[PDB]
Structure formats: C-alpha cells, structure tokens
C-alpha cells in the first residue's frame, strides 16, 4: 500500500499512542510466499546459527532464546525478495521522519532471519534494548502460511507498560509489526511447536546510537 498514508495516518498515531502497530497483509500473498521460499532455502542450506545475546555471562544462550538466525544485508543472491521487504520497511520509516516520538531515525541493523524450530523453543521475557544501544523501533515481518497458534504456539506476547492488557501477536503470514524497542515493551516468544519464521530489523535513533558507538569504541 502507498507508504505515505500508511505511515502518517496509521503507523505514526498507533506508535505514539500504544507503542505497538500491526499492519496485516503487508506485501500480499505472492511476495510473502517468495520470502518464505528464500527463508526456507537459508534454513535448508545450513545458514542459521544459535541466536545470541547482547551480554554473555555463564548461561547457555539456549536457556534464553531457542531460535537460529542469520543476518541478511538484502543484496545477496537468493535473498532478493527479503531485500524488497527491507526496502519496503525502510520506505515506511522514511515517511515517518520526525514523527515517531522524539527520535531521529537515520539507520538500522541488517535483517535477522530467525527460526524457532518447533520443539517448544521460544524466547524468555526480555527487552530488545534495555541499556541504550541505539535501537528505538523493532520491525518484524512474519511469514508462516498455515500457522494455527492455538495448536502451534509461538505467540509474541508484549507487555506494554501502563496498559490494562497485554498484546498477543500471532506470527501470522504477511503480518508486519512495529514496537518501541526500549523498556516500554517487554516481550516473550511463547513456546513454538512447529517451525516458525520471522524477519526482524531494528531502527536506530541517531543520537542514542552515536552515544552507544562511542561507548563501544572507547571500551
């Protein structure tokens, strides 16, 4: 759908009021299935490795998050439709410039293609960016044709601060999700009992990301 109206008349007010915004049927069936094929080929060719954490202490990562992931820049052969998804997400964010809170969004991460390979894997309750690493908006595209969450689980449960309800996001085919990455939105991926795929990017606030980079580059 045209980016300007979707951004300004839906995504922006949704985010500023609730800190969470769901856009269903984002790219359509044909493109969504092409993304699915590209993701399944990354899976089948052994590209995924254990999901990792910002800080590592004694714990196995698998007691925290049970997904397997790879990072995609968008230009790789065989990831062209993932690249189109990334470009579409970026187009929406660019049309939101200066209207998402007080953030100045200038950049983002690579895309994280993630699979919870059934078997009850999930992700314990956490905050995407608790300590100021620059991430201000998490954007996730789901691609699970045939997902029945009542059987297969895998709901992303978000606990938005100050709200009388939590937000249950089933990982529905062709669903796009945005939410503030900071402590306003703790969230868990509830156990998945079938193979579950999602593609995430995180958008940076320029000034916070600059401070985080200074911290990293000085030790």
């Amino acid at each position: 759908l045209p980016a300007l109206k979707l951004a300004l008349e839906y995504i922006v007010p949704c985010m500023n009021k609730h800190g969470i915004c769901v856009v269903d049927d984002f790219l359509g069936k044909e493109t969504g299935q092409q993304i699915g094929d590209e993701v399944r080929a990354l899976h089948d060719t052994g590209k995924f490795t254990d999901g990792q954490l910002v800080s590592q202490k004694s714990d196995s990562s698998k007691d925290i998050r049970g997904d397997k992931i790879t990072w995609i820049e968008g230009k790789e052969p065989g990831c062209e439709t993932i690249g189109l998804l990334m470009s579409s997400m970026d187009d929406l964010i660019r049309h939101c410039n200066g209207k998402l809170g007080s953030y100045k969004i200038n950049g983002r991460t690579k895309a994280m293609v993630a699979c919870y390979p059934g078997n009850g894997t999930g992700y314990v309750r956490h905050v995407d960016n608790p300590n100021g690493d620059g991430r201000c908006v998490t954007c996730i595209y789901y691609l699970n044709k045939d997902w029945d969450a009542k059987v297969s689980g895998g709901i992303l449960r978000i606990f938005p601060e100050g709200k009388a309800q939590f937000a249950d996001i089933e990982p529905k085919f062709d669903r796009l999700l945005f939410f503030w990455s900071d402590r306003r939105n703790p969230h868990e991926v509830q156990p998945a009992y079938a193979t579950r795929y999602a593609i995430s990017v995180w958008y940076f606030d320029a000034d916070e990301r600059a401070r985080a980079k200074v911290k990293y580059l000085t030790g």
């Binding site: 910002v54 800080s55 964010i93 991430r135």
Partner: peptide, 20 residues
C-alpha cells in the same frame, strides 16, 4: 535485579550499520 542486557537479542556493534 537482573542485568537485562543478558536477555537482549544481539546486534553487531562494530562495522557501520545500514544508512537510510
């Protein structure tokens, strides 16, 4: 309390980052 960075999903801190 718990250090929430130990539960936060990793992102590269080095390299550039993609510029919009």
């Amino acid at each position: 309390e718990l250090d929430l960075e130990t539960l936060a999903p990793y992102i590269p801190m080095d390299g550039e980052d993609f510029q919009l």
